[PDB]
Amino acid sequence: GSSGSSGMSRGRGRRDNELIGQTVRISQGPYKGYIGVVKDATESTARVELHSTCQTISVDRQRLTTVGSRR
């Protein structure tokens, strides 16, 4: 039926799983120039799932260049 959670609040500030799902493009490492979706966000790394190799690899959050369609 039509049921829901009394409160519509998930996180107070900015959840570490925010960047999770965004398109990131590796700039460093052996995967330089590779695209992937951030699956997990680490303190000094980020588990991204490549599109081609369709594999989940961890890379420095910084080493990752957040992608974003432009003109």
From Swiss-Prot:
Changing R10K: Increases promoter association and enhances transcriptional elongation. Transmembrane segments: none annotated. The modification Symmetric dimethylarginine is found at R12. Residues 18-51 form the KOW domain. Ubiquitously expressed. The modification N6-acetyllysine is found at K32. The modification Asymmetric dimethylarginine is found at R10, R12. It comes from the Eukaryota. Methylated by PRMT1/HRMT1L2 and PRMT5/SKB1. Methylation negatively regulates interaction with P-TEFb and RNA polymerase II. Phosphorylated by CDK7 and CDK9. Phosphorylation by P-TEFb (CDK9) at Thr residues of the C-terminal repeats alleviates transcriptional pausing and promotes transcription elongation. Dephosphorylated by the INTAC complex when transcripts are unfavorably configured for transcriptional elongation, leading to premature transcription termination: dephosphorylation is mediated by the PPP2CA component of the INTAC complex. Dephosphorylated by the PNUTS-PP1 complex in termination zones downstream of poly(A) sites, thereby promoting deceleration of RNA polymerase II transcription. CTR repeats lie at residues 68-71. It is found in: Nucleus. The modification Omega-N-methylarginine is found at R10, R12. Changing R12K: Increases promoter association and enhances transcriptional elongation. Belongs to the SPT5 family. Interacts with SUPT4H1 to form DSIF. DSIF interacts with the positive transcription elongation factor b complex (P-TEFb complex), which is composed of CDK9 and cyclin-T (CCNT1 or CCNT2). DSIF interacts with RNA polymerase II (Pol II); forms DNA and RNA clamps that stabilize Pol II elongation complex while maintaining the nontemplate DNA strand in the transcription bubble and nascent RNA in the exit channel. This interaction is reduced by phosphorylation of the C-terminal domain (CTD) of POLR2A by P-TEFb. Component of the DRB sensitivity-inducing factor complex (DSIF complex), which regulates mRNA processing and transcription elongation by RNA polymerase II. DSIF positively regulates mRNA capping by stimulating the mRNA guanylyltransferase activity of RNGTT/CAP1A. DSIF also acts cooperatively with the negative elongation factor complex (NELF complex) to enhance transcriptional pausing at sites proximal to the promoter. Transcriptional pausing may facilitate the assembly of an elongation competent RNA polymerase II complex. This is Transcription elongation factor SPT5. The gene is SUPT5H. The chain holds residues 694 to 757 of 1087 of the full protein.
